[model samples]
Target: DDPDATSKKVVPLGVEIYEINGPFFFGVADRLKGVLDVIEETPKVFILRMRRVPVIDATGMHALWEFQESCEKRGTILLLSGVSDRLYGALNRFGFIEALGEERVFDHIDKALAYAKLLVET
Candidate 1:
């Protein structure tokens, strides 16, 4: 596995899960261009798990913002899960909740994926 590898998969309920492992610093931002491009396969709901991510720098936030905006433009739901308390604060301070909506952030992957499943069911 490459040091920069990011994992992506289409799970049940047609949710696309992208797992980001390790710190989300400036360099990771560059690596995400490919990840975003691949997600253009267009699963209706995009789940980004931050469980393994230790931190998010400004560049990472910008990358996430851009990704969220792209998803919005594509009519895709962007969901965040497993964010650490510190990273959550950064996101909050950066006003991501206001921009991305408060409802889409979740405590864990299962809960996030559950919401996506419910959305599809409804």
Candidate 2:
């Protein structure tokens, strides 16, 4: 892979899945972008809460890659919870699992939050 490689658009957090919202993929995406910005502000543990299925279209996947890079660069740990199995497989197959082999990404929100808190301690 070239170090200079670039993607067209920034990856988004896809959809928010709470018990109330049920599960829904982000249609407009702009609202999602705003939510991400709010999360990125504190520089603490980043928890990507997933409720609905992640639509891993080419554009959205690219954003995930970029989002990971941003977190890595900033020394922040990102935890992903409630991710779809297909999305998890895609991350694993694309070498993101290895690239992020440090265990920053997680399948459980509570666990990831704990790790992130620990990361802050360390």
Candidate 3:
């Protein structure tokens, strides 16, 4: 192991912060604080790059967390991409993805654009 090493706080001068809002249907905020870091720490994010959101079916089955509202109030852009069938099924079964009125949640960005259009219309 290399003993000579130093740790420094990386302050991204031009770090593009991707702010998002959403609450777990049954999740705690304390744990979510860690997850939120991903959005805040994103670098040079001219557009939010999304991929693989494996929302376990049991993600928010008990807490009834309301994360989406918080995200919307903050005016953050949420780009949903790389979703799996399991996660998609969960979102559909619970009708959460639509309820949040997210712009896009698809494999490709273009597919997501369709939802973006829907978002604008509504």
Candidate 4:
């Protein structure tokens, strides 16, 4: 509804965060390719904030799955925060939680970042 809803965040610490502003569809998914390349210095904990994203589709899921794979290959931990129940259900039904790790899903960005800090320290 809000055209200016899409915005990005930045932090210079050991952790890096990305805030997504669109619904997870082809439009969004298509751009996800090489998105990680924007990261120069890899952070131990990489959080993907989805507070603005209310829903998701197959393309979105596949996009995230691919992103996760890339993250795994680079040893970059991808964490999902502020996920909607519907979106969560979609990912959970396919046993996506197991691969992503149950602890990686968070309802709040603060909680997610807190965990990320802990992960960075470890």
TM-score of 4: 0.84
Q: Over the full model, what C-alpha lDDT does candidate 2 score relative to the true structure? A: 0.52
Error of 2 at 54 (Å): 4.1
How well does candidate 3 match the true structure in TM-score terms?
0.44
> Poorest 10 consecutive residues of model 1 by lDDT?
1-10
How many backbone collisions does model 1 have? 0
State the C-alpha lDDT per candidate: 0.78, 0.52, 0.42, 0.78
TM-scores for every predicted model: 0.83, 0.59, 0.44, 0.84
Which is superior by lDDT, 1 or 2?
1
lDDT of 2 by residue, 13-53 (tens): 32122221223334423234333445535465565655354
Distance from true location, Cα of 22 in model 1, Å: 1.4
Q: Pull out the clashing pairs in model 2.
A: 11-63, 17-51
Clashes of each: 0, 2, 11, 0
User: Could you tell me how far off, in angstroms, the CA of residue 100 lies in candidate 1 after the best superposition?
Assistant: 1.0
Better of 2 and 3 by TM-score: 2
Candidate number with the higher TM-score (1 or 3): 1
For candidate 4, write residues 14-61 as lDDT tens digits.
Answer: 777777767888987888766677778877778888877888888888
lDDT of 2 at 12: 30
Q: Report the Cα lDDT for residue 91, model 3.
A: 71
State the lDDT of candidate 3 residue by residue for 1-122, as single tens digits: 52211122222243232212233333343444434345554322112223334554355532222444444544544445445677667776787677744444566444544444444444
Model 3 stretches astray by more than 4 angstroms: 1-30, 33-55, 61-65, 108-122
